Amino acid sequence: RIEEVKERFVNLNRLFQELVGDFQAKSDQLVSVIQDMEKISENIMEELKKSGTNVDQIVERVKEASSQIGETLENIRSIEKLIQNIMRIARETNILALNATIEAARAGEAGKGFMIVANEVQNLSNETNEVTKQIVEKAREILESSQRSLENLEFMANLFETVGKTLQNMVRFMENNVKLLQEVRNSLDTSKESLSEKSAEIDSATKVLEET
Amino acid sequence: RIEEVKERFVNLNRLFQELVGDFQAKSDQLVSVIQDMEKISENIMEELKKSGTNVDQIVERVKEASSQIGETLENIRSIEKLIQNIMRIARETNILALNATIEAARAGEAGKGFMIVANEVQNLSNETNEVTKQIVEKAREILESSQRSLENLEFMANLFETVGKTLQNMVRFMENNVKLLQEVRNSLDTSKESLSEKSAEIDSATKVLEETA
């Protein structure tokens, strides 16, 4: 009759033992899965850090390529001012020769020698002016090319903006991920311990009942 | 005596129940963060993939940028060819100016004026020669810059190549991590429900005992 209610306790004790036992098994198994990727996560965080250095270098490299394009733009400006000077020299040489040929014709037979030489200096002056425009044409091509480069570099800087922001969002997510996982493990370990402690006390108490 | 044990169970069960309830509360809160993180993860994966295509575009653009420097390289080389032509012309004009002073000097006093113009043409030719030297100096500095920029683009291209890989690695991790998250959620979901049923069963049975015997 009293032995009748004893089986009730023992039975209840079994229920606790089976519950905690399952809990221990479930959480340890969960903890193992979390741990299994703890290594893979360290490599990733270390990779995100090195990524920041690559990002920083790229931002400066793009900066450097721009200032350099800005250097040849300056040099072309100089070449253009210089080539214009050559052009003026050609023109000044040209009228000196032209006016030379006129006066050469003023004088008689002796002027013929000077006339011929002055005629050639003219042709040469006109040829220099011709090459000059060819250089201008090239200089202008380089200006066009350079402008397309500066725009291409801005396009790159624009597009890379998202890339930098994305890696930053990744680093943050990784911190929050690590933190969430820690809390998960923390709740599991803490709960398993306190609960297992509880069934341990329920087990002993049970032993007392049957013991005497 | 059945009493001291019965009171022991009642007390222990009570405390036991408080603990389970506590794990369920904290469990619920963690699950809420997991779910939110799975959504955040989804967005970051989309960001990662967009950065990938962005980097691909950039890889193609640095190649274009390299073509542009090379074209300036061809043109600046064409300019040096053209400058040499002007240099030959200036030499050719100088000796003509030289044979001119001589002829004027042999003409007599009437050649004094023709000597002046020829002397100036010489000087002008010499002038062209000097300006040309400055142009050569500038034309080389552009080459120096262009090559320097070509090496910058080269190291840039391979720098974008590292980021591109890193991006694919991140995509790989996020895909994996999302699975872990889903797995932890599911594990928590099922355990909460079973722990609840099992704990309720023991709770009821404790109450049935506490009231009898």
Q: Write the DSSP string, A97-131.
A: HHHHHHHHHHS-TTHHHHHHHHHHHHHHHHHHHHH
Measured between alpha carbons, how far is B46 from B43 in angstroms, rounded to an integer? 5
* Inter-chain residue contact B117 with A99, CB threshold 8 Å: yes
Measured between alpha carbons, how far is A24 from A193 in angstroms, rounded to an integer? 9
What does A141-193 look like in DSSP terms, one character per residue? HHHHHHHHHHHHHHHHHHHHHHHHHHHHHHHHHHHHHHHHHHHHHHHHHHHHH
* Inter-chain residue contact A34 with B180, CB threshold 8 Å: yes
- Chain B environment of A8 (Cβ under 8 Å): 205, 209, 213
Identify the CATH homologous superfamily for domain A1-212. Answer: Methyl-accepting chemotaxis protein (1.10.287.950)
* Inter-chain residue contact B159 with A76, CB threshold 8 Å: no
Which residue pairs from A145-150 have beta carbons closer than 8 angstroms and sit at least 24 positions apart in sequence? A145/B68, A145/B71, A145/B72, A145/B75, A146/A69, A146/A72, A146/A73, A146/A76, A146/B68, A146/B72, A148/B68, A149/A65, A149/A69, A149/B65, A149/B68, A149/B69, A150/A66, A150/A69, A150/A70
B171 and A CB contact within 8 Å: no
What residues contact A98, with CB distance under 8 A and at least 6 apart? Answer: A118, A122
Where do the domains of chain B lie?
A: 1-213
Method in brief: X-ray
For tokens 């909460």, name the residue. B192
Helices A2-36, B112-211: axis angle to 10 degrees equals 170
What residues contact A117, with CB distance under 8 A and at least 6 apart? Answer: B96, B99, B100, B103
Local structure of B181: helix, strand or coil: helix
What residues contact B122, with CB distance under 8 A and at least 6 apart? Answer: B94, B97, B98, B101
Contact indicator for B51, A54 with CB cutoff of 8 Å: no
Amino acid identity at A107 = A
Amino acid identity at A167 = L
For tokens 């050569």, name the residue. B136
A166 and B CB contact within 8 Å: yes
Resolution at which this structure was determined, Å:
2.2
Contact indicator for B52, B164 with CB cutoff of 8 Å: yes
Measured between alpha carbons, how far is B144 from A77 in angstroms, rounded to an integer? 17
Local structure of B66: helix, strand or coil: helix
For tokens 């300056």, name the residue. A74
Q: Which of B65, B110, B202 sits opposite A12 (nearest CB)?
A: B202
Helices B2-107, A111-211: axis angle to 10 degrees equals 170
Measured between alpha carbons, how far is A89 from A142 in angstroms, rounded to an integer? 24
Measured between alpha carbons, how far is A45 from A37 in angstroms, rounded to an integer? 12
Which residue in B39, B103, B116, B135 has the most chain A C-beta atoms within 10 A of its own C-beta, making it the best mutation to test that interface?
B135
Backbone phi and psi for residue A107, each to the nearest 5 degrees, phi listed first: -75, 165
Measured between alpha carbons, how far is B118 from B102 in angstroms, rounded to an integer? 10
Fold classified for B1-213: Helix Hairpins (1.10.287)
